[PDB]
Amino acid sequence: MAQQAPDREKALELAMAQIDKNFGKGSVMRLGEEVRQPISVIPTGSISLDVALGIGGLPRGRVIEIYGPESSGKTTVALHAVANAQAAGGIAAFIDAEHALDPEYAKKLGVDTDSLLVSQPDTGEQALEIADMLVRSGALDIIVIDSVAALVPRAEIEGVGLQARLMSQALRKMTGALNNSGTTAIFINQLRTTGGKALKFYASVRLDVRRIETLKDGTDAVGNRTRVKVVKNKVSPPFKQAEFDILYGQGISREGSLIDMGVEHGFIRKSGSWFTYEGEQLGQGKENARKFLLENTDVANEIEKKIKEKLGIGAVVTAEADDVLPAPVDF
Template sequence: LVVVDSVAALTPKSEIEGEMGDSKMGLHARLMSQALRKLTATISKTQCTVIFINQLRMKIGVMFGNPETTTGGNALKFYASVRLDIRRIGAIKNGEDIIGNRTRVKVVKNKVAPPFRKVEFDIMFGAGISRSGEVLDKAVDLDIVKKAGSWFSYGDTKLGQGRDAVKQMIADNPELSEEIETKIKEALTQE
């Protein structure tokens, strides 16, 4: 596994050697195009996974369509087998402190499976993706956990009020989490 953290930070040699104010159009795009032509065969032969992390930029003067674009030209878009659009859609707070992010991931391109799928999940700082949040969300989607207003119930048991409280209860109660997960797996295998 190779991760290139930020395509935007890759700098062509001529830009490093040049003066500060020099304008060189398309250098970054040419660098990416050439690099991907060279790397594609090697990546395929070695059965390696390469993850490119990129940033969004705004196109100037776009009147219609999406003004957002990624750096490095179009080569990366064409060569990629899977492209994911990952966005923060909200903050998870504990009082005034932000303890995580609610994140939405959309599959923009997929050569190996159906594209345009979306998923939302919690990323907790210092812990990663919240497993208890995933279990709760999927259980609610599959009607294993019932949601009425802000109250959640599992069978005849009231789990609690508010998503965060129920998420914490599932995290603190491994037997309950395991039981709900088993029912989720059973429901998914029947589909």
């Protein structure tokens, strides 16, 4: 080389060059790197968690894990990422093992329940089997499994080692057909190790979702402020964070997102009372501005785009900005 010399950057690039080469893309990155923008992606439904994932949504053909304490926001997230998939006329499966979906809450989010394949597995060696067997076909686009913690091994539900081995296997047999089909998988996880102590490594994306404040300002408490930290992202630098709202019954607050998200970058101003926009006003009081966007889809689609144009993302317009070495630029 030239050791007892300097750290000059030329050589190090060959390393990575090869590491990404032997272990595949994503094996080594610089946290604040330039992200590789793809074409196919499933928007999560919250602009915030989107750019947080850095690519616009969730990656395809990759397994994603969503763990977190009860009633935090996982399923929704799932349920939304599920609806959007369908917006591109896709087939989405759902493996029930918790027996807790309310097809009508799904209904208000976007889900075309009547098209949604919902299996209710007899045991653990079935939700994984029907999963893969439903996966190897390749007609789907996104398959969801409710709780990695309730997939008890055939043996157990009758008459040690099992669950982790169960996951370890099928998830090895499956991580292989999902990539060769672009079928993205979501594995909800109810944290409160052995089961997902494979999924952990098998996964590409791993979202951590926790409830924060109980959205307060009127009728009683209408929503909940969810934070989400992407502790593992083998498709873009990791450790990013996005916070967002999910109104009871309403779902993840898109509009609400666009505001905090739209000011946190300079497209939307002042706002003592008043949240103005490029000259005109969107209203006084967040909820109100929240109202004006959900009453003016047009203005709403102008702030989601504009923003997705200042930070990459695979899309619609921007058309010139993107390339030639290193930089997020401020916080």
